[PDB]
Design a protein around this ligand. Structure first.
Ligand SMILES: CCCCCCCCCCCCCCCCCC(=O)OC[C@H](COP(=O)([O-])OCC(O)COP(=O)([O-])OC[C@@H](COC(=O)CCCCCCCCCCCCCCCCC)OC(=O)CCCCCCCCCCCCCCCCC)OC(=O)CCCCCCCCCCCCCCCCC
Ligand SMILES: CCCCCCCCCCCCCCCCCC(=O)OC[C@H](COP(=O)([O-])OCC[N+](C)(C)C)OC(=O)CCCCCCCCCCCCCCCCC
Ligand SMILES: CCCCCCCCCCCCCCCCCC(=O)OC[C@H](COP(=O)(O)OCCN)OC(=O)CCCCCCCCCCCCCCCCC
Ligand SMILES: CCCCCCCCCCCCCCCCCC(=O)OC[C@H](COP(=O)(O)OCCN)OC(=O)CCCCCCCCCCCCCCCCC
Ligand SMILES: CCCCCCCCCCCCO[C@@H]1O[C@H](CO)[C@@H](O[C@H]2O[C@H](CO)[C@@H](O)[C@H](O)[C@H]2O)[C@H](O)[C@H]1O
Ligand SMILES: CCCCCCCCCCCCO[C@@H]1O[C@H](CO)[C@@H](O[C@H]2O[C@H](CO)[C@@H](O)[C@H](O)[C@H]2O)[C@H](O)[C@H]1O
Ligand SMILES: CCCCCCCCCCCCO[C@@H]1O[C@H](CO)[C@@H](O[C@H]2O[C@H](CO)[C@@H](O)[C@H](O)[C@H]2O)[C@H](O)[C@H]1O
Ligand SMILES: CCCCCCCCCCCCO[C@@H]1O[C@H](CO)[C@@H](O[C@H]2O[C@H](CO)[C@@H](O)[C@H](O)[C@H]2O)[C@H](O)[C@H]1O
Lengths: 86, 172, 459, 601, 52, 171, 98
């Protein structure tokens, strides 16, 4: 499959978040905490991870998923697993 | 279980949604039921009696076991998926490069020059890394598997080599 | 046979008078020449055996064993010279001297025309073998392994000596050629029952027969590689060769005395194969594999049919080369990880790709893939044992299923899966190690092109 | 005979030179896969010349060129039987193998061990031709076990995967249990007829063939994955898709049927064996088609289709129609190998996705894959006048106009209906609807290697049945007089299967939520046969290793022997060193010497 | 001849010596040379021993 | 030809003449002509050159003829010198008789292939001759054992002869 | 506790000799020992030994027996005698008990 890049991963991670109705696509930034800033709760965070899993076609274990609390953390996690260094 | 009640509910939620997605298949159908399922969790989200909440969870687990898909969807590279461990036969450890014949190492003069620098960095950092762990581990040994970050500048995080230098997920 | 005995003895002066750094070069070079000349033993005739003199003769049963014996000496020197590299020079020469003396006794054992001469040389092999195990073994338990080997063998041999001397008294001769014409039937009596047991129980122990097999896993686990190669390849075959010669004078009593020993071999082969599935030690797995393979030879020798003796002959040669190869393969790993645990070093095909091809080839011969001589020998025993009683096909068939299971399981455990992370001293295979395996597998596969020369005198 | 005999051997010799060059290493690995693909394409052409000679003048010959070994009165030779079955299977096998290797040049392009992969594919084909052309059971046994080992090395291609090692060993386990029957046959034939050569077996024509034929039936069960020894074939989907394509078409799985066709002069006079094989095939075709109804993995659906088809071939053996069973082997080879290649095209384009639930909307996105997949599904279901019609349609008419088990017949018709149901399942979920795959679209199917390889098999799936059915000589009286409702049975039930499957497939779009029935789980979990047997049988065997044995042990233990010697030693040596006691014992020795033993008398 | 490589004749010489001893032993076993019922024959013009 | 047709007989070959009923050209005809020119001619030329080298060097080898010697029935008990020659003679006969059964089996197998679908009726003499030869071989050698000998062979025959004597005395 | 040498660290022949064949620490001996093994082992025993075995003269008179068997079959069929007669020994030379 065609290779990924750090900016490509960040573009798609936000793209998915921008299509979620509980998030304000204007307040969204790579460093927005899903809990403190975006006002989401534990249950919404789970669905965000599932959306990223469906986006990139691979599973994030629950032990790792619960710690991804801002979009940048998700981007960093994906790059580490896909060996993306751009 | 090591997991808190809060962690247990979330794992069930993610597990329940995934098995629901296997049943529905069609995305529009899955969306309709996923929202109904989220409603059931949202109904008791504010329950404050931990005997009732614990009961609600246990009953939910029993319902999931009765309703689980016998053949749920698995991501191809997840445990049990059709591509799990497919590439382990291509992952060669980096220490194998030490045994290369000189003529083999001569074809990559620049890769093997960079490799030596990393080996030097590993040799020079090791003693500090061992010391940092000794003077941070409580008497009796560690209580968790969590390792510390580096504190000083020019210090590398303790026990980093086999994490940094691990094979790529598509090594060939 | 003096064209082979004298050259073999000359290996002793050659080793002792060789320059210090040349002991392994000279002994290996000249032991290969002796192996080359051993092909002259294949001047076999349809009717008469090759009877050189009053002391020694060769027929189609001893010739393949003689060629196997002399081929093995150069292979044991290659396998030995690594782990002895730090040994004292004189003790290196004594180790090589013990191997040379073992070949000397062995080639005379297989050609002796007099059974009491056979017994003395048959029993003389104990001394060099015992010394090799206990002196150059690496663990504490090598001393107990020495005693078990020693006293299991003598427990059966001493009754054998009495029976042979009794037979010469009443028949007048123990010359094998004479016994072919002067043999008389053995009638039912308690006296003849114990004469039968004495004549056979020494050979059953060396096979080994299931029940008397527990000395073999001990010896293998504790012996050095060269001790394991000779023990598996040739020394086990002494029992089979003795049984193929002695059964001539035990008829017709073998008709009913065989039954308990066929039952032990038919059931024993299923249990030893099953045990191989749960062995944690690699050398111990291969040892229990030999017990399973040699149980076929006992059954074949005891039912006494033309097809069963051809099968048993092929099995002994084929198993000799295969079992020796497997031990050398497990030794190559041991010289790296210094352990015999099968589960310790995994996923080796990734790190040693060519050595993984040798493992595959050795395993396929062990499970007897057609048309290898391992299958040819195994098949002929199955065909004849089916005629003996149709029900045996079930036990024979089951054993082939289990034999496949543990042969490939040993291949999968050590060669496939993920490699062990912390083992980082798996250096590339040496030219010495690769040549050692090719010298087992190439001759083994070449014999498929011309298997008649390993099918014995009933071919 | 000079051109016929010479050219039928160069075909086999040509397949081995690529093997010789790799082993002899005088080749050029610059493009080894193309070299192996070229060798097949030429071997296919050279094998057509002997076939045309057979079609023309019915020519058949046996070649016994090398005397290998004599065993008293049993002489073994390298012996090749170039007859009806050999001359028709070889070109079909080579033609399909030609397509699979061309497809493999694209599918396995990024595999670092591609050269070894093509070496194993070629050896896998070489052993199948040894099996097909063998004139005696020993040479046949070489091919029998050859394909078994090559299946092991190709199913477990990704040897880092634990499940690939489990699946590879499971193929060996089941096929080796089948070989118990094969060894049984060779033992009976040697004992009772004095031969392993087929000419003598047929000439002596044993009347009492219950034992040798059950041995061959048990051998065929494992190799062809009939009920009882069936699970390994679905598990063989661990290997790369080209392995599945070649494994399931023109190599291993039809060797079991091909073995029973070789021995039709015996089975045609044994009604007991015909009943056993008919019922064995009937249960196999129903059971594995029922499992396919609810599988979500595309390769497993096609894999269970093959088991279902192999059951139908075994049914044909049962109703004493050896040549129909052979024609179905040839026709099934085309469209089955194409379906596996069409599935590989989808899997490759969806980034190694195999679950059908995450496909959809591919009808227009993958036009050529879609065309071949519809032709393949129509050929499989027995659409009039496609490759599969010329065998399946004949077989069903023969079965229901025969003196046969009524239950076996019914189960073969129901399974035929199921074939339409799970063919609709693949088409409906893979191609129709809305896309369900991830967002980053990488669908591309424009490689000429992919297109050409499927294009050639597509053409075979259309006309091959017609071409073969019109060129083979007739060897039976085909029953062509029957009621309208027996003539049209296969078409009708197949049509009902399409209708019924369409309604259920459309039934999944509704906003209803349902609990799995016991029936649904039973089919989904493959009847629980793998779940139970693969935990119970390994556990009983791996954990498998009275007072009478206590005596036989405690008494004869080396500890017992060695510990009694220790007691006796201590009694002998634990003395006080006293002159008084030693001489007192001298007195006792003398007294009992005279009083008790009369040594002085 | 070299003091380096004189030990390389011990085993080749052993073969020749052993081969010669083997031939001599055959001389002690000529009791039936040209006397077996299967093989006895009259002697050729210059023959003196059918084998040796 | 090159073997004795009497030992390995073959019925005369009857091949029908071509009688095409199609305007099309037979592909086999052209392939035959190409095979003859491309394959047969160069292969024949190489052979003829080789057979010219052989002609310049013609030497001979012979089939060993064994004189007959007294059987085991004429050997005094425990007389090894006479027993040994009768035993070697018996073993050569045993190995020869194994080959006679192979010749007859070869005739039978060749017949079954040659006749085709008519083999059941057309291979009755080969089948009959195989049945008779296998009977004789079985009576001679079957059940002797791995350590067989002329002595054991004789003892088997005597037991058979006594049984047949009682067969005639009984009727 | 008591005076003893510690176990020496295991050594790697490739460390000081990347061309090592594994036979010896001395490169000159290491190459020599390789050549005697490969030459005598492969060039001589396996190649010549296999050629020698291929051309063994009529090992155990298997070819002679066939030639003789052909001669007897030709004779007995021409003279009308049975190809093989059940009695292995001439019954005139036997004297049954009783
Ligand atoms: C006269 C005296 C002459 C002496 C004898 C001459 C023959 C020996 C020549 C050896 C030297 C040639 C050489 O350099 O080999 C290069 C050859 C390939 O070189 P490479 O590219 O570096 O491959 C690296 C790996 O070794 C390659 O490993 P790999 O696993 O990828 O492939 C190697 C191959 C091992 O080689 C083979 O076995 C050839 C394929 C079998 C046919 O592995 C297998 O074959 C596994 C499947 C086993 C066959 C199962 C099918 C059974 C068929 C039953 C019917 C048998 C017909 C009768 O290396 C070897 O494989 C060495 C094996 C030597 C034994 C060959 C045994 C022949 C069988
Ligand atoms: C092609 C597809 C792949 C098939 C496999 C490829 C190989 C087959 C092609 C070769 C064909 C040529 C051929 O085989 O014929 C020549 C023959 C077989 O055919 P042949 O028997 O008919 O001989 C032909 C020559 N005439 C006509 C005179 C008989 O090959 C051999 O006989 C080789 C014998 C090898 C066995 C001896 C090994 C050497 C001895 C070393 C001793 C030490 C080893 C350990 C001792 C063990 C105990 C004995
Ligand atoms: C511990 C050992 C101590 C215990 C005592 C051992 C002896 C007890 C077993 C008795 C053996 C049988 C026996 O003694 O038979 C004697 C028999 C005498 O018969 P004889 O007079 O010579 O001939 C004319 C016959 N009226 O002799 C004969 O006729 C033929 C005798 C042939 C040789 C027999 C050798 C005895 C074998 C006994 C051991 C057999 C089991 C070996 C087990 C090995 C275990 C690994
Ligand atoms: C059930 C059987 C299972 C067998 C399993 C084992 C299979 C091993 C692999 C087999 C490989 C193919 C074997 C066939 C090739 C020929 C081998 C051979 O040496 O035969 C030559 C032939 C032998 O004589 P033959 O009558 O057949 O019987 C001899 C008894 N052993 O005598 C001849 O005809 C001489 C041949 C002359 C060739 C001239 C052309 C050569 C051109 C150069 C070649 C390079
Ligand atoms: C079955 C047919 C042949 C049987 C022959 C049996 C005769 C005995 C042979 C072995 C003799 C060994 O003699 C002695 O045995 C015991 C155990 O057996 C060994 O001792 C070992 O086992 C014993 C108890 O099992 C332990 O207490 C001891 O710690 C352990 O070292 C001795 O180290 C050995 O010197
Ligand atoms: C590994 C263990 C193997 C165990 C094998 C067991 C085999 C058992 C063999 C039993 C046969 C023994 O031999 C049998 O006994 C005696 C010999 O004393 C013979 O008979 C002789 O002694 C008995 C004494 O009871 C008298 O009745 C009889 O008058 C006399 O002729 C039998 O005719 C003979 O057939
Ligand atoms: C079939 C005939 C076979 C004949 C074999 C030859 C017999 C040789 C007998 C040697 C016996 C003496 O060997 C001696 O056996 C005892 C067995 O308890 C061993 O005893 C071992 O286990 C016992 C308890 O089981 C311990 O108390 C002891 O500390 C330990 O050494 C001795 O370590 C060993 O020295
Ligand atoms: C018919 C039987 C034939 C048997 C053939 C056996 C072949 C064995 C080959 C061994 C070859 C060794 O021959 C070798 O020659 C050289 C000079 O001549 C000797 O001397 C050498 O010593 C060292 C090596 O240790 C060299 O660095 C030095 O340059 C050289 O002087 C060696 O000490 C000797 O080992």
């Amino acid at each position: 499959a065609p290779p990924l890049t750090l900016e490509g991963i960040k573009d798609r991670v936000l793209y998915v978040l921008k299509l979620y109705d509980k998030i304000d696509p204007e307040k969204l930034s790579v460093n927005s905490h899903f809990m403190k800033d975006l006002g989401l709760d534990s249950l919404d965070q789970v669905e965000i991870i599932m959306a990223m899993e469906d986006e990139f076609g691979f599973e994030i274990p629950d032990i790792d998923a619960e710690k991804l609390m801002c979009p940048q953390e998700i981007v960093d996690y994906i790059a580490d697993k896909k060996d993306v260094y751009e | 279980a090591y997991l808190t009640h809060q962690q247990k509910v979330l794992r069930l939620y993610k597990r329940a949604l995934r098995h629901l997605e296997s049943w529905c298949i069609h995305r529009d159908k899955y969306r309709y039921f996923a929202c109904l399922l989220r409603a059931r969790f949202d109904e008791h989200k504010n329950e404050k009696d931990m005997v009732k909440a614990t009961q609600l969870l246990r009953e939910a687990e029993e319902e999931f076991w009765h309703g689980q898909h016998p053949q749920p969807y698995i991501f191809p590279e997840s445990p049990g998926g059709t591509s799990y461990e497919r590439y382990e036969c291509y992952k060669v450890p980096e220490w194998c490069l030490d045994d290369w014949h000189p003529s083999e190492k001569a074809m990559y003069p620049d890769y093997f020059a960079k490799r030596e620098q990393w080996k030097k960095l590993r040799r020079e950092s090791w003693e500090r890394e061992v010391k940092q762990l000794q003077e941070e581990t409580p008497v009796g040994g560690p209580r968790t598997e969590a390792l510390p970050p580096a504190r000083k500048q020019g210090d590398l995080p303790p026990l980093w080599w086999h994490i940094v230098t691990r094979p790529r997920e598509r090594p060939m | 046979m003096l064209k082979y005995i004298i050259p073999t003895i000359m290996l002793m002066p050659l080793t002792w008078l060789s320059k210090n750094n040349m002991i392994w070069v000279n002994s290996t070079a000249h032991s290969l020449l002796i192996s080359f000349t051993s092909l002259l033993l294949m001047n076999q005739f349809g009717d008469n055996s090759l009877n050189f003199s009053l002391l020694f003769f060769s027929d189609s049963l001893s010739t393949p064993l003689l060629i196997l014996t002399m081929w093995l000496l150069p292979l044991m020197l290659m396998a030995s010279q690594h782990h002895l590299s730090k040994e004292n020079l004189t003790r290196k020469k004594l180790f090589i001297t013990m191997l040379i003396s073992l070949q000397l006794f062995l080639i005379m054992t297989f050609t002796a025309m007099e059974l009491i001469l056979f017994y003395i040389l048959f029993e003389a092999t104990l001394v060099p073998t015992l010394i090799i195990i206990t002196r150059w073994g690496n663990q504490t338990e090598r001393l107990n392994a020495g005693l078990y080997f020693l006293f299991y063998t003598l427990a059966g041999s001493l009754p054998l000596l009495v029976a042979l001397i009794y037979i010469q008294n009443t028949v007048g001769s123990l010359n094998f050629l004479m016994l072919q014409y002067w043999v008389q039937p053995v009638h039912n009596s308690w006296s003849n029952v114990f004469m039968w047991l004495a004549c056979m129980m020494a050979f059953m122990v060396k096979m080994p027969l299931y029940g008397l097999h527990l000395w073999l896993p001990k010896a293998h686990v504790e012996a050095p590689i060269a001790g394991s190669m000779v023990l598996a390849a040739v020394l086990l075959k002494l029992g089979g060769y003795g049984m193929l010669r002695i059964t001539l004078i035990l008829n017709p009593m073998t008709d009913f005395m065989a039954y308990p020993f066929i039952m032990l071999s038919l059931w024993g082969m299923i249990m030893t194969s099953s045990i191989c599935l749960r062995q944690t030690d690699l050398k111990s797995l291969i040892a229990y594999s030999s017990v399973s393979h040699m149980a076929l030879v006992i059954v074949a020798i005891l039912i006494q049919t033309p097809w069963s003796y051809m099968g048993a002959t092929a099995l002994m040669i084929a198993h000799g080369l295969t079992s020796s190869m497997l031990f050398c393969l497990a030794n190559s790993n041991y010289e790296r990880i210094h352990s015999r645990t099968m589960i310790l070093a995994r996923g080796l095909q990734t790190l040693l790709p060519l050595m993984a091809t040798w493992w595959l080839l050795a395993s396929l011969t062990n499970l007897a893939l057609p048309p290898t001589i391992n299958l040819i020998g195994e098949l002929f025993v199955v065909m004849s044992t089916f005629s003996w009683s149709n029900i045996t096909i079930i036990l024979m068939g089951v054993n082939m299923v289990i034999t496949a299971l543990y042969s490939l399981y040993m291949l999968i455990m050590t060669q496939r899966g993920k490699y062990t992370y912390h083992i980082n001293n798996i250096s590339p295979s040496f030219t010495r190690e690769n040549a050692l395996m090719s010298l087992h597998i190439l001759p083994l596969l070449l014999l498929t092109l011309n298997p008649k020369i390993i099918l014995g005198p009933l071919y | 005979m000079n051109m016929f005999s010479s050219l039928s051997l160069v075909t086999l010799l040509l397949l081995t030179m690529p093997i010789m060059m790799m082993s002899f290493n005088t080749y050029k690995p610059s493009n080894y896969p193309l070299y192996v693909k070229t060798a097949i394409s030429y071997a296919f052409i050279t094998s057509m010349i002997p076939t045309m000679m057979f079609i023309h003048s019915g020519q058949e010959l046996i070649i016994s060129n090398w005397h290998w070994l004599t065993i008293q009165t049993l002489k073994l030779s390298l012996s090749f039987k170039m007859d009806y079955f050999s001359m028709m299977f070889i070109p079909v096998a080579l033609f399909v193998t030609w397509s699979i290797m061309e497809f493999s040049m694209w599918y396995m392009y990024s595999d670092p061990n591609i050269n070894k992969f093509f070496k194993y594919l070629l050896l896998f084909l070489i052993t199948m031709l040894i099996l097909v052309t063998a004139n005696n059971l020993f040479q046949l046994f070489i091919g029998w076990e050859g394909v078994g080992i090559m299946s092991f090395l190709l199913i477990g291609w990704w040897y880092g995967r634990a499940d690939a090692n489990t699946a590879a060993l499971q193929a060996i386990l089941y096929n080796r249990i089948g070989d118990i029957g094969f060894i049984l046959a060779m033992a009976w034939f040697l004992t009772n007829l004095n031969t392993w050569d087929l000419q003598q077996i047929f000439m002596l024509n044993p009347s009492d063939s219950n034992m040798p034929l059950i041995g061959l039936a048990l051998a065929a069960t494992g190799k062809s994955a009939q009920f009882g020894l069936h699970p390994w074939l679905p598990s063989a989907m661990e290997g790369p898709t080209p392995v599945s394509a070649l494994l399931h078409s023109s190599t291993m799985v039809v060797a079991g049927i091909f073995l029973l066709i070789r021995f039709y002069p015996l089975t045609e006079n044994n009604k007991y064996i015909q009943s056993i094989t008919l019922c064995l095939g009937a249960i196999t075709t129903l059971f594995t088609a029922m499992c396919a109804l609810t599988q979500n993995d595309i390769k497993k659906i096609i894999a269970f289709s093959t088991s279902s088809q192999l059951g139908l071939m075994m049914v044909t053996i049962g109703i004493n129609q050896p040549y129909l069973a052979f024609l179905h082997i040839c026709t099934h080879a085309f469209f089955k190998a194409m379906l596996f290649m069409c599935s590989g095209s989808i899997i490759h384009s969806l980034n190694d996705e195999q679950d059908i639930r995450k496909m959809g909307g591919l009808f227009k996105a993958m036009p050529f894959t879609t065309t071949a997949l519809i032709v393949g599904s129509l050929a499989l279901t027995g659409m009039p006048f496609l490759t599969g019609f010329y065998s399946k349609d004949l077989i069903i008419e023969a079965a229901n106009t025969s003196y046969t088990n009524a239950w076996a017949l019914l189960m073969t018709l129901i399974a035929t209906s199921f074939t339409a149901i799970y063919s609709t399942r693949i088409i409906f979920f893979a191609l129709l609807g809305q896309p369900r795959f991830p967002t980053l679209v990488n669908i591309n199917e424009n490689n000429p290697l992919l297109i050409n390889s499927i294009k050639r098999l597509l053409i075979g799936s259309l006309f091959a049945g017609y071409i073969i059915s019109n060129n083979i000589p007739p060897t039976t009286i085909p029953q062509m007089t029957m009621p309208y409702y027996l003539k049209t049975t296969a078409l009708i039930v197949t049509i009902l299967g399409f209708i019924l499957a369409l309604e259920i497939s459309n039934m999944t779009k509704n906003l209803k939520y349902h609990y799995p029935s016991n029936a649904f789980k039973f089919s989904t979990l493959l009847g629980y046969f793998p779940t139970i047997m693969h935990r119970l049988a390994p556990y009983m065997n791996l954990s498998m290793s009275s007072l009478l044995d206590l005596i036989w042990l405690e008494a004869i233990l080396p500890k017992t022997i060695s510990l009694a010697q220790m007691k006796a030693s201590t009694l002998v040596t634990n003395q006080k060193g006293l002159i008084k006691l030693y001489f007192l014992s001298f007195l006792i020795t003398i007294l009992i010497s005279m009083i008790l033993f009369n040594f002085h008398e | 001849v070299v003091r380096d490589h004189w030990v390389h004749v011990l085993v080749p010489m052993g073969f020749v010596f052993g081969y010669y001893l083997d031939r001599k032993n055959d001389e002690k076993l000529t009791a039936f040379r040209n006397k077996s019922l299967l093989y006895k024959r009259e002697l050729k013009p210059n023959e003196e021993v059918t084998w040796k | 030809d090159s073997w004795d047709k009497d030992v390995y007989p073959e019925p005369p070959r009857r091949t029908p003449a071509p009688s095409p009923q199609t305007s099309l050209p037979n592909p086999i005809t052209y392939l035959t002509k190409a095979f003859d020119l491309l394959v047969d001619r160069p292969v024949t030329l190489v052979r003829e050159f080789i057979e010219r080298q052989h002609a310049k060097n013609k030497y001979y080898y012979y089939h060993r003829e064994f004189r007959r010697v007294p059987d085991i029935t004429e050997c005094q008990e425990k007389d090894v010198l006479c027993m040994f020659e009768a035993e070697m003679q018996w073993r050569r006969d045993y190995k020869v008789d194994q080959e006679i059964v192979n010749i007859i089996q070869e005739r039978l197998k060749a017949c079954q292939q040659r006749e085709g679908e008519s083999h059941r009726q057309n291979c009755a003499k080969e089948l009959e001759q195989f049945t008779q030869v296998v009977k004789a071989y079985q009576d001679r050698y079957h059940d002797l054992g791995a350590h067989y000998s002329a002595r054991k062979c004789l003892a088997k025959q005597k037991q058979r002869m006594l049984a047949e004597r009682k067969a005639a005395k009984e009727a | 506790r008591w005076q003893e040498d510690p176990e020496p660290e295991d050594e790697n022949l490739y460390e000081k000799n990347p061309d090592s064949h594994g036979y010896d620490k001395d490169p000159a001996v290491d190459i020599w020992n390789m050549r005697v093994v490969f030459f005598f082992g492969f060039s001589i025993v396996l190649v010549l030994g296999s050629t020698f075995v291929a051309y063994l003269p009529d090992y155990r008179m298997q070819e002679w027996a066939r030639r003789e068997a052909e001669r007897l079959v030709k004779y007995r069929e021409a003279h009308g005698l049975p190809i093989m007669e059940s009695n292995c020994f001439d019954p005139s030379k036997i004297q049954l008990p009783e």
